[PDB]
A paper describes a structure:
As a result, TcSpdSyn IC50 values for two compounds were determined, with compounds 1 and 2 inhibiting TcSpdSyn at IC50 values of 82.27 and 43.41 μM, respectively. To examine the binding sites used by these two active compounds, we conducted X-ray crystallographic analyses to observe the structures of the TcSpdSyn complex with the two top-ranked compounds (compounds 1 and 2) in the hidden binding pocket, as predicted by the MD simulations. Compound 2 interacts with Glu22 and Asp77, similar to 1, and the lone pair of the quinoline nitrogen atom in 2 is proximal to the carboxylate group of Glu22. Thus, these results suggest that Glu22 is in a neutral state when interacting with the lone pair of quinoline. Compound 2 interacted with Glu22 and Asp77 (interaction energy values: −20.08 and −30.05 kcal/mol, respectively) through two hydrogen bonds in the same manner as 1. In particular, Asp77 interacted with compound 2 in a neutral state. Moreover, some weak interactions, such as with Ile71 Tyr245 and Ile247, were confirmed, with interaction energy values of −7.16, −6.96, and −5.71 kcal/mol, respectively. Comparing the structures of compounds 1 and 2, both are para-substituted anisoles with nitrogen-rich heterocycle para-substituents. However, the X-ray structures display opposite orientations for compounds 1 and 2 at the new site. Compound 1 interacts with Glu22 through the hydroxy group at the meta-position of anisoles, while compound 2 interacts with Glu22 via a secondary amine at para-substituent.
Numbering used by the authors:
A (entry chain B): 5 to 170, 176 to 179, 183 to 237, 241 to 294
B (entry chain A): 10 to 170, 183 to 294
The structure:
Amino acid sequence: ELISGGWFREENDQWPGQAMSLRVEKVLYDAPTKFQHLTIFESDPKGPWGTVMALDGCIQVTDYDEFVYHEVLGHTSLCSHPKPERVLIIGGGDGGVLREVLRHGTVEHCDLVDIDGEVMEQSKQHFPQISRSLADPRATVRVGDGLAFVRQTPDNTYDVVIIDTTASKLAFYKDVLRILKPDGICCNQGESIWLDLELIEKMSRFIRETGFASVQYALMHVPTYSIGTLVCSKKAGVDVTKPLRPVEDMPFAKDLKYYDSEMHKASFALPRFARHINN
Amino acid sequence: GWFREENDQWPGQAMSLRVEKVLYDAPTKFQHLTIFESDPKGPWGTVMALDGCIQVTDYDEFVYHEVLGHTSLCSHPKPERVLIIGGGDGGVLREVLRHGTVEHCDLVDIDGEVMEQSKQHFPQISRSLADPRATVRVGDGLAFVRQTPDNTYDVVIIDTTAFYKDVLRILKPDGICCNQGESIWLDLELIEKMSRFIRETGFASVQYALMHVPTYPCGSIGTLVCSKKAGVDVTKPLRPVEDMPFAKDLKYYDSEMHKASFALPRFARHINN
Ligand SMILES: C[S@@H](CCCN)C[C@H]1O[C@@H](n2cnc3c(N)ncnc32)[C@H](O)[C@@H]1O
Ligand SMILES: C[S@@H](CCCN)C[C@H]1O[C@@H](n2cnc3c(N)ncnc32)[C@H](O)[C@@H]1O
Ligand SMILES: COc1ccc(Nc2ccnc3ccccc23)cc1
Ligand SMILES: COc1ccc(Nc2ccnc3ccccc23)cc1
């Protein structure tokens, strides 16, 4: 339904009476998928955004800002683990998180499971700088439901599980805890302290009560939206807020556009109204 | 009935709010002033825009107000006399006046209509304007500082929409200056140029602090925190807010947030070194 020269409009049920719009230079994809509406377009070349992906009317990836959420999810988790060798990504069909995971020399294998094979296909076509990772021999990329995937995973399979999703069931957290090895780290796309503070409070407590030893929420600075990540440790006495394996000691630190150890530490400082999430 | 905000810096992008009720909409002697009640099912409440750019909403005003007010004052060893340039809504002043060390604050905003419309439509922001420790003037900040004697202020806060040499001059030796600092998203070249312009006018140091706002279509909002005295580290609170009686009244700012605010994404880090 979208056309070139028209505007893409984004609205939110949580924030009614607000809309965010982008001019569409060129439609690249606009169709229902087996699971969701997929919209890819080139935004205004006078603007900074580049190619833009939306799922069910909500922007999920742009060329300009993708490095933020990808670096944060990939490095805050892996740098909190003593030796991450086996990694699971749930969602992340675009490849961004996987690219960041694969920078780490300790990773021998990463499994990626995204329900929507068309997201992965369209990302190969229209976001090669994000999706190149999906071809890596250190990765196995599967089309399937992450819920069923973790249910059929044996105990103690993964060092890190990263949940990079949009959907709504993501019982599941008990499976995640079970498939993690004893030093395990889980991290998730965490929702907004502005939109959904009560949800973060709720999720944080239900994750701890599932049996995770600790859960800390990290905030990120994106150019437009808040977005956070819940970083969960299976093992008691882990402080995920200070990098266990600082990125600065690894050869790729200087390739990163957002993340470093100072950013990692700062991300866990929350505005005072939300600070009770982390204590 | 939707208010739409666009930027020349960000072409092909727009942010819109539904207008529930127009409260004020007229040219002023200096700028277009628009005040509206936004959607009561949304979180924003009353919204003020100047020349088509939103400057204040009931919902988020605490962020920029607390950050400008406290990052500066907690970076000063004993802030007694404070100047605010702009800030006609009263938000920064309200924050500055929480500090017990403050004996007097002058506030100078070019547009008297902004203070009048804030008195009417943002009483929880503009209450401060009536405080006996405050003197409010309607006038240009540039001319005001030009006619201010040397070593008058402990802190100058620039809360707006040669001057800097006058700001440096009117500051006492431990003086702190802070300004509404613009977005590291695209707008980065300007912050870099501002920070160099400020150091070269003779401030000893300039550090940029980032804030987390619920929406900013212009990218991000920050503050440049500048110290007249050499060897001051404005990135670590000199007088922690936690030692003061009003710390728990704050909705955003604390010492953790103060320290964190100066940690910049890698691409922008060269702003602060
Ligand atoms: C695009 S990614 C979000 C953008 C940040 N890279 C969101 C992905 O999660 C997938 N997703 C949603 N639900 C699931 C389940 N249940 N399992 C796996 N992947 C899922 C969905 O297909 C998106 O590609
Ligand atoms: C509303 S405040 C915006 C930030 C939200 N506290 C911006 C104020 O700066 C004033 N302003 C703009 N230029 C000047 C000058 N030159 N002098 C004083 N005040 C000024 C303008 O009238 C706004 O009220
Ligand atoms: C999950 O990682 C993220 C993090 C941030 C975004 N940001 C944006 C959301 C919606 N519309 C936009 C429009 C333009 C730019 C960014 C956005 C999306 C996914
Ligand atoms: C001086 O500091 C600030 C900081 C933040 C804003 N916020 C908003 C700016 C622009 N459009 C919006 C649209 C909707 C909501 C908020 C905003 C203004 C001034």
